[PDB]
């Protein structure tokens, strides 16, 4: 209930500054996201890249997620057991960079990017947990 309430659950600990849920089936669209932030502006084309059959093209120059440039760390979305993705934002002029994680469920994609100085493992473990719960709910 209340797709936005998950975002509140995502922001309970304050270790992240952006969080979103998007349904990647049929026409991609955001179901709940932090207003005014990065994750609210996800385009279907970016979703198609994330779930596309090509798992090597995003290694040449990274990819964009909501228009913000980010680099690929490890890709395990299509592999059973984790269904998780790791990204790090790409910045210019020594601007702060942040770790980005994406977990793939049956119907949804869960996206978390943490605040400054936050280790990716903390961001990954949370997104895996709620993704694990959400798949147990047949979504």
């Amino acid at each position: 209930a209340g797709w936005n309430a998950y975002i509140d659950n995502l922001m309970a600990d304050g270790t992240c500054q952006d969080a979103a849920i998007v349904g990647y089936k049929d026409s991609p669209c955001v179901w709940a996201a932090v207003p005014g932030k990065t994750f609210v502006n996800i385009t279907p084309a970016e979703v198609g890249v994330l779930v596309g059959k090509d798992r090597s093209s995003f290694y040449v120059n990274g990819l964009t997620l909501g228009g913000q440039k980010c680099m690929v760390i490890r890709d395990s979305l299509l592999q059973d057991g984790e269904f998780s993705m790791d990204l790090r934002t790409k910045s210019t002029g020594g601007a702060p960079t942040f770790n980005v994680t994406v977990t793939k469920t049956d119907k949804t994609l869960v996206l978390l990017m943490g605040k400054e100085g936050v280790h990716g493992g903390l961001i990954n473990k949370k997104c895996y947990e709620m993704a694990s719960h959400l798949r147990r709910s047949q979504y």
Partner: peptide, 8 residues
């Protein structure tokens, strides 16, 4: 969006 399941 479809109805959401209960929170953890």
């Amino acid at each position: 969006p479809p109805p959401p399941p209960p929170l953890p």
